[PDB]
């Protein structure tokens, strides 16, 4: 009747080291009240990418994200991507210049090494503090990141200079919130600023904190409190 | 008429290095309005243990806890123990198997090196993803911690394998909150998740943050704001 989809990282499952962990947890899920085929286990291998286009399969999605300082990705940036509904298009930095439209039009770029330099254009296609000809005059706004949500003064055209060799930059519109998902973060006291806006900080119920000890423990808790977690989504 | 009991760690007093610090502070306490014998000074030497069975002596208890990253104990786990009313019984991992009953039945183990492996039993005393015979098939949920509050899927029996040599594991029921106590934490911005439940995060008045500089300063502040601190407990 209803379905629960658990998203975790590879490292999570690797640490568990059992060929039947998905199965054991499933029987344990009957306890909390979910029928034999009612729960599904999806394995994301690369969080950054998954966060962008996370093909959510089930009715209820609870995604496990473990703070990993050895990857240099911002938890906030990742939350902002999963917790929300984004809609991206591709950008051709080579032939076209771009401009963001509203507080919801952002440039999300990600890859090996993302280095973005920008040059604002006046209404003539001329630089403002830069020469659209020599990128040595551009303004650097990202130096080799793995995930970057860039924000420029709305309503202004910009010649962009990304290192497309190792990066991919796409033009995204954030249309709202996703109700069928939840974020459960493991580790790092870290408070999440998921607003581009320095003014606001929203803290929702679909944004939960578990204290890391071992992965088996994490899953036991997720199971022992499935309804509590589900109730925070349906609420 | 009323009594105030200050709990601090040894290091706190050692840094103060005076044979009359308890006395000096006491005269200073008359200022804030507490009679010559109205305040008591209790020295906990081991926070982990104290947090479990803290024989609270006075009417008002304000306990000083200093974030110490060189001990690997979770502040949240420690808060969860002091701030609340727990009631434990001993567990014999050798002869019996166990199961937690409600969102309030947890297994709190602590010692030199606590390493807990678990094996869920179906209604036959048979393993589920494990052989109750070889602990190499168990599920590890704690690898050498100094304090551990373990949580398993409620209503399921488990053969437990703790390293009782260096650890002690006891079955605790959390019956509620303690009103005569307060936690004043020193250091670490750290926000405290004192719920086993990933869904909720409760922040109470009896859970206060002081910025560390020197211990003498900490005590001066505690004295300079005794009533403010007391009012947060009686409130």
């Amino acid at each position, epitope marked *: 009747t209803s379905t629960l989809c658990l998203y975790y990282p*590879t*490292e*999570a*499952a*690797t*640490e*568990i*080291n*059992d*060929n*039947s962990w998905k199965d054991t947890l499933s029987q344990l899920f009957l306890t909390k009240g979910w029928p034999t085929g009612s729960v599904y286990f999806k*394995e994301y291998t690369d969080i950054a990418s998954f966060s962008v286009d996370p093909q959510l399969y089930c009715d209820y999605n609870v995604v496990l994200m473990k703070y990993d300082a*050895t990857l240099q990705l911002d938890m906030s940036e990742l939350a902002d991507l999963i917790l929300n509904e984004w809609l991206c298009n591709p950008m051709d930095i080579t032939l076209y210049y771009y401009q963001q439209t509203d507080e919801a039009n952002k440039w999300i770029s990600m890859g090996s090494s993302c280095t973005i330099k920008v040059c604002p254009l006046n209404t003539q296609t001329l630089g403002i503090g830069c020469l659209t000809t020599d990128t040595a005059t551009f303004e650097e706004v990202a130096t080799a990141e793995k995930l970057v949500i860039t924000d420029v003064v709305d309503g202004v055209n910009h010649k962009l200079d990304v290192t497309t060799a190792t990066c991919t930059i796409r033009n995204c519109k954030k249309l709202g919130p996703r109700e069928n998902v939840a974020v459960i973060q493991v580790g790092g006291s870290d408070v999440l600023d998921i607003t581009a806006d320095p003014t606001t900080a929203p803290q929702t119920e679909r944004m939960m904190r578990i204290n890391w000890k*071992k*992965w088996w423990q994490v899953f036991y808790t997720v199971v022992d409190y499935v309804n509590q977690i589900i109730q925070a989504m349906s609420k | 008429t009323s009594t105030l009991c200050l709990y601090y760690p040894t290091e706190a007093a050692t840094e103060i290095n005076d044979n009359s610090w308890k006395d000096t502070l006491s005269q200073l306490f008359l200022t804030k309005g507490w009679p010559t014998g109205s305040v008591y000074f209790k020295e906990y030497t081991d926070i982990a243990s104290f947090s479990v069975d803290p024989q609270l002596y006075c009417d008002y208890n304000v306990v000083l806890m200093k974030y110490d990253a060189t001990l690997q104990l979770d502040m949240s786990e420690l808060a969860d123990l002091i701030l609340n009313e727990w009631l434990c019984n001993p567990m014999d991992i050798t002869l019996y198997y166990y199961q937690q009953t409600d969102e309030a039945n947890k297994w709190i183990s602590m010692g030199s090196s606590c390493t807990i492996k678990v094996c869920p039993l179906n209604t036959q005393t048979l393993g589920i993803g494990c052989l109750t015979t*070889d602990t*190499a*098939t168990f599920e*590890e949920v704690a*690898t*050498a911690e100094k304090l551990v509050i373990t949580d398993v899927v409620d209503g399921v029996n488990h053969k437990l394998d703790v390293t009782t040599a260096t650890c002690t594991i006891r079955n605790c029921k959390k019956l509620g909150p303690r009103e005569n106590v307060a936690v004043i934490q020193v250091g670490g911005s750290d926000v405290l998740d004192i719920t086993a439940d990933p869904t909720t995060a409760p922040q109470t008045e009896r859970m206060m943050r002081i910025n560390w500089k020197k211990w003498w300063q900490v005590f001066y502040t505690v004295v300079d704001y005794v009533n403010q601190i007391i009012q947060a407990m009686s409130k």
Partner: antibody
Amino acid sequence: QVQLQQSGAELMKPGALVKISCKATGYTFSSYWIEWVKQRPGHGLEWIGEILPGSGSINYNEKFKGKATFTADTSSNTAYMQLNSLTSEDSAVYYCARNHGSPDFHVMDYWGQGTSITVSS
Amino acid sequence: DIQMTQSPASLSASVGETVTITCRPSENIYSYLAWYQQKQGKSPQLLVYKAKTLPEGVPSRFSGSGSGTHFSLKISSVQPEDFGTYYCQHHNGPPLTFGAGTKLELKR
């Protein structure tokens, strides 16, 4: 381009204890389990146990529990196995292989070169 | 304790011929069987996992098959590079146990 390099060969006196080591290169050391296999001339391959560096999970073949004890240094990127109370029959070749990821559990894909121990008074 | 039973203990053939080693576990290894090849004076090398799947590098004349209590490996157009010892191991959870081994010799 993954690779585990084990320490050099040694020869202890009966009763002593030794330290083998495996150094990882080419993968996130903390994210994969390390296996330990014993190989005597006429006994094929014996599994000893495994260890998960970082988290610290450990598993012992019931038959080695007393003899072997694993450790791992994350800063070093090396896993260690220590054989206690050496016997003339502990003499053999010891390997350390990487236990693949979540995909397929317990399939060792990369093997060390092999360390060699000889107990003889 | 799952007991792997490798046969034959020794096999003998010349290049081009098609041999077939065979592992038979005491219990039911669902399909969690592997095959490693070890060459004279070196280390083992994963050659086949989950019964029939081969890692990447590995040639394709190497064919794994079976499930349950019967499994088989099947080197086909044996070339001079396929001569040495072959082991089989189940990977259905600890404790892991290996085969006895099959030694493939060069006929003549």
